[PDB]
């Protein structure tokens, strides 16, 4: 005999949401993009006890991972990055005739990446678009957010804000946060040239160098890093994404400690 | 120094996918819909050692859970259904002034439901649409599948099939599998009247009665059950969905054992 | 020297909105539609001290009034209904060769109707769609609401609820609330035949008879009344809309007092 | 017993509309945009007895105010700008822990701003798009108007004109009037760089400096001012918009008196 | 009495497709575009025993040939190019008052061109989009592929790869492969100016000069050649297309033999 | 040194097209649909010396064959139907563990089917939609045709006609010709119930019985036959389609000879 009431359900949702919102509008780190790089970054920062929010446009997390390679629902990871997936429980299978190369179910990975982030203490908000940055003297000091619903519906409605010590552009190929900063504030002299064509080995190894603070308060990781610094793309192999996100976390953790 | 090759990445994805496909085209149970009811059903069946596939249209699982209530990212669960979420690790918080009523993060729940299903041994395939049924004498004997990409692109391309002992319509409000069966085979005398307006208590309690075998080989659970048997909708409270999915699993497990 | 902060602006909006929401989810009367009939009804009920919310799909109130007649930005009103517009401050100009017939600026009217409603104490919420009803034994006991943004974006997100003693369908030509009730709960034997063609005099006078309780807890007024009871349409003359809304208010006020 | 006739209704609308049109095609000031800055400007100019028309694309006035902040239906105002809203009857509530900061119902504000403008004598026309300017030797001498219906329908139909001594671009973020002037007449050497990212305090204070005559006969106010002069955006706080509109009015009133 | 089974049909399609895919991901030549130039090139290369794949976006081959001239279903060919169509069985009819000029059924030609390519040993894959290139030191070493379904559906899914010694852009007017190379890797200093207006004689004769290796590993033929080198277009006369494709084949065969 | 002229190219296309059109507007048989069933039917009728035209909506022939099964580019054929594909040169490969079952490249098949039809003397016109029938006393005496361009563009342009002794609906799942006849001429008492769900063996064997003259002058073959007579669908196995088309041809050849 289940017990359920409309008013109580509605009231409960409103109370949890409004408590959540009042808390989440000031954070240590706001990561933009709930793909593999962003969710990895979120886990490793939150793991150290800092207050982290991930903002993802789509209602589901996962970014461009779900469809694997051309719809074939597996993705690839190379050592030592496989270890990052093992930490969150992902089953990995060896590739035939290839040492240190593994495949994983493209549906399993996002789920487990997200759980890792949430259980480490990161808050993941979906249906939220970062449309701009909050600025202070010589730095990025937060994000300007709107709902995916409002964006996709095309309604003329103003955004609200989340204040952050650090922001991370983990938005994938488009590097949409860095792109917006550079476009609306041209006097900063930032440029997003976009990625080069596919060269997997060069692309993967460029990511670690390209994962860094682009402007004070704003880091970039994942494919966004190679868009900002013109690295090569690498196809459906994700070790670089995970290591990039992990590295981004370590850099930001260091800066948070120094203060 | 990361090691990566385009051919090896591509080859690896192809090999894992084609092994997966050759195995998955005959199953014990094909569940249609990767929402809360479908993912719960998948866990409880796979948990007993049977071969289960979930087929979900969208690239991400989770169904209509991600947005909580009107975008406020929390959902509600009432006892004893809260216990089903605790089994998969979901954090629950008590609702103020309400006994046996809990809220949960609307992003956390789908992630953990999916992990539960997959770790129990269920295979979850996304970007797959069930467009029809495979029939035998007096029963449903499988599903007719196409890709979401092909559907959304509008391309005129034929489906393939997955053979199953049992099929479950866990497709939500539309009851799209039962609806298709009844529409294309009118001589079966099936009808999908659709749900009634909102009455949460009546809706929740109708679900258990409405979770059943609609035609031999075809079960229904979740909101689809109330669409097929004209139960009330209940709003953003999910205990009924979880219990319905669990019950559906138990019914089907019993039938599989009897054979 | 203006003082402004992002966090404070955001916090302030969140606090006012969440206080508003927690209060508004239980009301005496929920009026659906912020057109001329709905806004008039709202004023006359709130004026008597009852707790009223108007729910309007579009971000602006006003319904189908703004464009006047075929874009010519004037609407017409006939006595004694002109008196209802005078009560909210609308300037009226006599029509040449016609006694008891006036024109009014089609932009002025909605503005002043809305102010009248708000200053009488009615809450007007825009960007909100009533998609269904909350039911109890033999009656309508509230509304099921979602955002226009979510509807127009096509996102699969559950609604929340507002509990009410009375609901009013003031949704215009479509009578969308009565239509939904009748469609989803066919055993109630309700039908919405839709309006007849234009006969202004017959249409206007049918409205008063057609303004009534269609099912316990659910009233209808404005053009919705003639859609439900197959009255004629009347063109860009609005006296009937105002009187219908006023009458609807009086009927509901009486029922609230009797309890 | 209501009296209504189709021919009389139609005739009445035609007569009022055509009288209105013949009068409105020559004005002192044509304000483009019926948002908060434009409606404030309109009130303060009309208040001094000058002939003002506001031209707004959408059928409703209000611009980007209705949805508050990310759909939460409240907006913020800081002193002394709160006084401008009090003049038109808006209820304001103090923000907790913040002096000189208030919230207001995002539906109430547009309604009351519009009433203020109309009751001061400004004419507000909606469903009208300014697509270009009328030019004379070294100045803007009017606006080129079409209907929103014609624009949105994509029909190839010529515009008509309203002659004005002064035109005001109060079109918001896009600064669409100044942008069009600069694009079609490049030899004027005007440029619209567009706004910078969010810095609320700097954005708000830049508005007063940025509210000015961009080219003889053409003023800019509201967010359009910061688009033209590359000021920062400020989020859902509106004091700057109101003060900008008020200042724009005072500047133009002075110029009208000097002649 | 026909014999048919769902599982066997599905299994058979999966086995043939996965064998095909594992073989086709490394080739001698990957031709992009299954129009007249691409299909001619494919025949003449495969004819010499090399491993060739043609990748075509649309589900059918044929490119822009099917509609003839403005829907009139005939195309034109001039000597000696007519001989290339005779080799694949196309019926040709002399044009009245014109020596060495022939018409052919615009539906017959693509069919026979495709058969010629396939029977020579070329594999033609349709519904496949080349979205990028695989690069090595100073050359193009393969293609980055996705499905047309995924592209047209707008899904965020990663591509896979086909390794090749040589790639051919036979994509028609857009020269989409060379364009992508030049856009994403600007430091290569490639440019695609696009075709000039129509001058048939000059356009046809420019093609042979313009058919060449644009960058090491990447050839161009057909209309793509005149887009890359700013040749004139020629209208619905195709001799240049066939000769260009044939020449492209000969050049690449020579390079393959030299190694 | 290629010779090409714009006027001569244009003139040549016009002359061939207009000769073609003047000839093709009266035929023995008009087959609607250039899929596998229609192209097979066309070959076997034209082979006997009769005047046949195939009318296909899309610019390419092939119907729903190109994509194989869910994009995997192979289709299946069972004996003795494999013999029909061997007659037109298609390479077939045996399915492992299955006697009398073969796979074929889904791109090769349409090409070779089309060549078979054309070389047998059938005219195939693409980009042509049959929108209606020409009627005489108790029979269908031709087809009403428009262009796909006109249909897809939505232009209000009248059709023209092709006179035929027999018309064949080979339009696939929709049975669009029979459907149109039955819809517009209800007094004929025709009905198109549509196909049943998938049962491959029953679907394949129903086709031969269902391939027949539905109304005097109008035959049906391919999947259209099972739509008209409520047979089962069979998935991506095509033997039934080929045999159905062949049988349709034989029936019509017999009727032509008897006259
Ligand atoms: C390896 C690879 N490609 C190789 C190749 O193509 O050769 C990939 O594409 C990987 O998926 C890249 O992973 P990565 O974590 O870098 O990005 P992703 O998966 O695309 O995730 C980014 C996420 O960010 C989201 N997003 C975008 N912009 C915004 C915004 N302004 N606000 C909120 N969210 C936003 C977007 O929806 C997405 O979920
Ligand atoms: C409680 C509630 N509502 C109360 C109220 O509204 O008042 C809900 O709406 C719940 O979300 C319902 O849960 P439930 O597990 O029943 O369904 P869901 O969440 O909608 O998930 C079903 C899933 O099934 C998917 N789906 C649909 N049809 C197909 C198809 N033919 N093939 C593949 N997948 C398909 C669809 O994408 C969706 O993800
Ligand atoms: C006199 C006349 N016509 C004569 C003739 O045509 O001959 C008119 O059309 C009048 O405008 C009718 O006035 P009335 O007050 O009856 O309606 P209106 O102006 O159309 O306002 C109704 C409002 O209700 C809104 N609405 C609709 N459905 C929903 C929903 N389900 N939830 C939330 N809001 C909804 C809708 O957006 C609209 O704004
Ligand atoms: C404070 C803030 N943002 C902060 C932030 O984003 O960080 C805002 O966006 C405010 O709403 C800005 O107020 P403001 O009065 O400047 O503009 P608004 O509200 O956008 O109103 C302008 C109106 O003008 C209209 N309009 C546009 N272009 C034309 C045209 N060519 N002809 C006719 N009308 C037109 C347009 O439809 C709109 O209604
Ligand atoms: C003579 C003439 N015009 C004269 C005039 O207009 O004056 C023509 O237009 C001829 O058709 C040109 O023949 P040609 O073989 O050069 O090209 P085509 O017929 O357009 O075929 C190219 C094919 O290539 C395809 N394609 C494009 N881009 C991609 C991609 N990125 N990946 C996969 N396939 C792609 C495209 O779909 C098309 O089918
Ligand atoms: C076996 C199978 N399915 C099994 C399953 O799904 O379970 C199939 O779908 C097969 O492709 C069916 O082959 P068949 O030759 O019957 O049909 P098809 O391939 O769909 O070809 C019909 C053609 O006819 C065309 N067409 C449609 N209507 C019109 C019109 N009014 N005028 C002109 N042409 C038209 C249409 O565009 C199409 O190209
Ligand atoms: Fe704004
Ligand atoms: Fe089919
Ligand atoms: Fe729901
Ligand atoms: Fe013009
Ligand atoms: Fe990618
Ligand atoms: Fe006609």
* Angle, alpha carbons C137-C142-C145 (nearest 5°): 135
CA-to-CA distance for D178 and D213, rounded, in angstroms?
11
Question: Per-residue DSSP letters for B178-239?
Answer: HHHHHHH-GGG-------EEE-HHHHHHHHHHH-EEEETTEEE-THHHHHHTTPEE--SB-H
Q: What is the DSSP string of E48-77?
A: TT--EEEEESSSS--GGGTTTBTTBSEEEE
Tokens of B234: 């209940």
d(CA A212, CA A206): 12
Q: Where are the alpha helices (DSSP H) in chain F?
A: 6-24, 36-46, 82-87, 108-119, 148-153, 176-184, 200-210, 223-228, 239-257
Cβ-count burial D185-206 (b if 16+ within 10 Å, e if not): eeeeebebebbbbbbbbbbbbb
Give the helix ranges, DSSP H, for chain C: 6-24, 36-46, 82-86, 108-119, 148-153, 176-184, 200-210, 223-228, 239-257
CB within 8 Å: A70 and E157: yes
Binding residues of B for NAD(+), by number, are 37, 56-57, 64, 130, 156-158, 176, 223
Structure tokens at A230: 């013109």
The overall longest dimension of chain C from CA atoms, in Å, is: 65
Cα B92 to Cα B66, B77, B115, distances in angstroms: 16, 9, 17
F130 assigned binding-site residue: yes
* Contact criterion met (CB below 8 Å) for D33 and D222: yes
> Which residues' Cβ are closer than 6 Å to ligand 4?
A 158; D 32-38, 55-58, 63-65, 129-130, 170-174, 176, 198, 222-224, 233-235, 238, 241
Bond prior to D77 in cis (omega within 30° of 0)? no
Give the pairing of strands C160-169 and C26-32: parallel
Q: Which own/partner contact pairs does E183-191 have at CB distance under 8 Å and 24+ positions apart?
A: E184/A194, E184/A195, E184/A196, E184/A197, E184/E132, E185/A196, E185/A197, E185/E135, E186/A193, E188/E215, E190/E214, E190/E215
Distance CA B95, CA A68 (A): 40
- Note whether A16 contacts B74, CB cutoff 8 Å: yes
Ligand 5 atom with least separation from CA of E33: 24
Q: Which chain B residues are Cβ-neighbours of A6 within 8 angstroms?
A: 198, 200, 235
> Which residue of chain F comes nearest to B179, CA vs CA?
F197
Is the Cβ–Cβ distance between C10 and C34 less than 8 Å? Answer: no
Q: Which residues contact B163 (CB under 8 A, 6 or more apart)?
A: B25, B26, B27, B134, B141, B142, E6, E7
Ligand 6 pocket (Cβ < 6 Å) reads B 158; F 32-38, 55-58, 63-65, 129-130, 170-173, 176, 198, 222-224, 233-235, 238, 241
Each domain of chain C, given as residue ranges in start order, spans 1-259
d(CA F214, CA F206): 15
Q: Which residues of C46-57 are buried (b: 16+ CB within 10 A; e: fewer)?
A: bbbebbbbbbbb
CATH of domain C1-259: 3.50.50.60
**DSSP label of F79:** T
C13-42 burial by CB neighbour count: b if 16+ within 10 A, else e? Answer: bbbbbbebbeebbbbbbbbbbbbbbbbbbb
Taking the CA of residue B163 and the nearest CA in chain E, the distance in Å comes to 7
- Convert A115-126 to b/e letters by CB count within 10 Å (16 or more is b): bbbbbbbbbbbb
Neighbours of F42 (CB within 10 A): 32
Closest CA to B178 of B210, B149, B137, B152: B210
Closest CA to F168 of F32, F63, F35, F42: F32
Q: Are strands D52-56 and D123-126 parallel, antiparallel or unpaired?
A: parallel
Q: Which chain B residue is nearest to residue C187, measuring alpha carbons?
A: B196
Nearest CA in chain B to C178: B197
Nearest to A2 by CA among B36, B99, B80: B80
Instruction: Check if E252 has its Cβ closer than 6 Å to any atom of ligand 5.
Output: no
Ligand 4: which atom is nearest the Cα of residue D238? 1
**Facing F73 at nearest CB: one of E10, E17, E72:** E17
**Which of F111, F202, F211, F235 is the best substitution to test chain E (most E C-beta atoms within 10 A)?**
F111
DSSP chain D: -----HHHHHHHHHHHHHHHHHHHTEEEEEEE--SHHHHHHHHHHHTTT--EEEEESSSS--GGGTTTBTTBSEEEEETTTHHHHHTTT---EEPTT-TTEEEEETTHHHHHHHHHHHHTT-EEEESEEEEEEEEETTEEEEEEEEEHHHHHHT-----EEEEEEEEEE--GGG-HHHHHHHHH-GGG-------EEE-HHHHHHHHHHH-EEEETTEEE-THHHHHHTTPEE--SB-HHHHHHHHHHHHHHHHHHHT-
CA distances to C160, D41, D110, D169, E245 from D38, in Å? 36, 5, 11, 8, 63
Asked if residue E208 lies in contact with residue E243, where contact means CB atoms within 8 angstroms, the answer is yes
Strand, coil or helix: B14: helix
Q: How far apart are CA E12 and CA E30, in angstroms?
A: 26
Confirm if C221 and C14 have CB atoms less than 8 A apart.
no
Contact status, residue B13 vs residue A68, Cβ threshold 8 Å = yes
Which DSSP symbol is given to A247? H
Cis peptide before C252, with omega less than 30 degrees from 0? Answer: no
Query: Contact at 8 Å (CB) between A89 and A112?
Result: yes
Q: CA torsion, points F4, F10, F11, F13, in degrees to nearest 10?
A: 110
**D225-to-A156, D66, D239 alpha-carbon distances in Å:** 18, 21, 14
Helix (H, G, I), strand (E, B) or coil at B90: coil
Tokens linked to D236:
């859902």
Q: Which of C254, C245, C258 is nearest to C44 (CA)?
A: C245
CA distances from F90 to B252, C230, E9, F70, F77 (A): 46, 65, 18, 21, 11
Query: Which helix (H) or strand (E) element contains residue A103?
Result: strand A101-105
Binding-site residues from annotation of D for NAD(+): 37, 56-57, 64, 130, 156-158, 176, 223
Question: Quick one: resolution in A?
Answer: 2.1
Closest CA to E74 of C143, B140, F14: F14
Q: Find tokens 């886990």 and name the residue.
A: A43
């Amino acid at each position: 005999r289940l017990r359920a009431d409309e008013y109580a359900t509605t009231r409960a949702i409103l109370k949890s949401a409004f408590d959540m919102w009042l808390d989440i509008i000031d954070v240590d780190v706001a990561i933009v993009g709930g793909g593999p790089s962003g969710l990895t970054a979120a886990r490793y920062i939150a793991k150290e006890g800092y207050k982290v929010v991930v903002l993802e446009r789509h209602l589901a997390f996962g970014g461009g991972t779900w469809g694997g390679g051309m719809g074939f629902p597996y993705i690839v990871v190379e050592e030592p990055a496989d270890e990052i997936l093992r930490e969150v429980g992902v089953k990995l299978e060896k590739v035939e005739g290839e040492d240190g190369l593994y495949t994983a179910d493209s549906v399993e990975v996002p789920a487990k990446l997200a759980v890792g982030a949430i259980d480490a203490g990161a808050k993941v908000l979906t249906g939220i678009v970062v449309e701009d940055l909050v600025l202070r003297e010589n730095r990025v000091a937060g994000v300007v957010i709107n709902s995916y619903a409002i964006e996709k519906a095309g309604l003329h409605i103003d955004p609200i804000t989340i204040t952050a010590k650090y922001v991370v552009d983990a938005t994938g190929h488009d590097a949409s946060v860095v792109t917006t900063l550079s476009r609306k504030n041209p006097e900063l002299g930032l440029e997003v040239p976009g990625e080069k064509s596919m060269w997997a080995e060069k692309g993967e190894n460029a990511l670690l160098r390209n994962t860094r603070e682009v402007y004070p308060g704003l880091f970039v990781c994942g494919m966004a890093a190679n868009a900002v610094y013109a690295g090569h793309r690498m196809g459906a192999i994700f070790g670089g994404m995970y290591i990039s996100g992990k590295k981004c976390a370590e850099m930001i953790v260091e800066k948070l400690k120094n203060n």
